[PDB]
Specification:
Strand content of chain B: under 5%
CATH class of chain A: Alpha Beta
Strand content of chain A: 25-35%
Structural class of chain B: little secondary structure
Largest interface: A-B, 22 and 11 residues
Largest sheet of chain B: none
Keywords: SHP-2 C-SH2 ITSM SH2 domain PD-1 phosphotyrosine, peptide binding protein
Distance between the termini of chain A: 25 Å
Shape of chain A: globular
CATH architecture of chain A: 2-Layer Sandwich
Shape of chain B: rod-shaped
Number of strands of chain A: 8
Number of domains of chain A: 1
Distance between the termini of chain B: 18 Å
Order of helices and strands of chain A: EHEEEEHEEE
Entry title: C-SH2 domain of SHP-2 in complex with phospho-ITSM of PD-1
Largest sheet of chain A: 6 strands, mixed
CATH topology of chain A: SHC Adaptor Protein
Chain A: Tyrosine-protein phosphatase non-receptor type 11
Number of strands of chain B: 0
Radius of gyration of chain B: 8 Å
Number of helices of chain A: 2
CATH superfamily of chain A: SH2 domain
Number of helices of chain B: 0
PDB class: peptide binding protein
Assembly: dimeric
Oligomer: heterodimer
């Protein structure tokens, strides 16, 4: 349903840009934190931003490292590019919450806990 | 990586 937003969850943040979502995780979140938001470069799609690596230097240095993942949203269908595609974003995030998705640079997004919407 | 929206290469 259009009134029943699938994004009415704690990990979905309304208006956030690429670095804003990053600032969210790098400053307010922690290792394994993820949040999905509406894409500004790709209007109509969503993005999963995650905090990869630890900030104490047991994975990388220079605080933690945030990667954002593109969630293709066509006809209210969500997919990062892996597994089954869901009509709800909750299933999407939880799917990769158990099955970490990997970048070609080695950065693999370990979705563990959602970044609470600070409002 | 930095924004970029990740490659996500499932091997």
């Amino acid at each position: 349903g259009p009134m029943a937003d699938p994004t009415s969850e704690r990990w979905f943040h309304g208006h956030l840009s690429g670095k804003e979502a990053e600032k969210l995780l790098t400053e307010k979140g922690k290792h394994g934190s993820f949040l999905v938001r509406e894409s500004q470069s790709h209007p109509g799609d969503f993005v999963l931003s995650v905090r990869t690596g630890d900030d104490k230097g047991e994975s990388n240095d220079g605080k933690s490292k945030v990667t954002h993942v593109m969630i293709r949203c066509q006809e209210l269908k969500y997919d990062v590019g892996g597994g089954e595609r869901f009509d709800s974003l909750t299933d999407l995030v939880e799917h990769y919450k158990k099955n970490p998705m990997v970048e070609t640079l080695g950065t693999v997004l370990q979705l563990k806990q959602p970044l609470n919407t600070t409002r | 990586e930095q924004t970029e929206y990740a490659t996500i290469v499932f091997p």
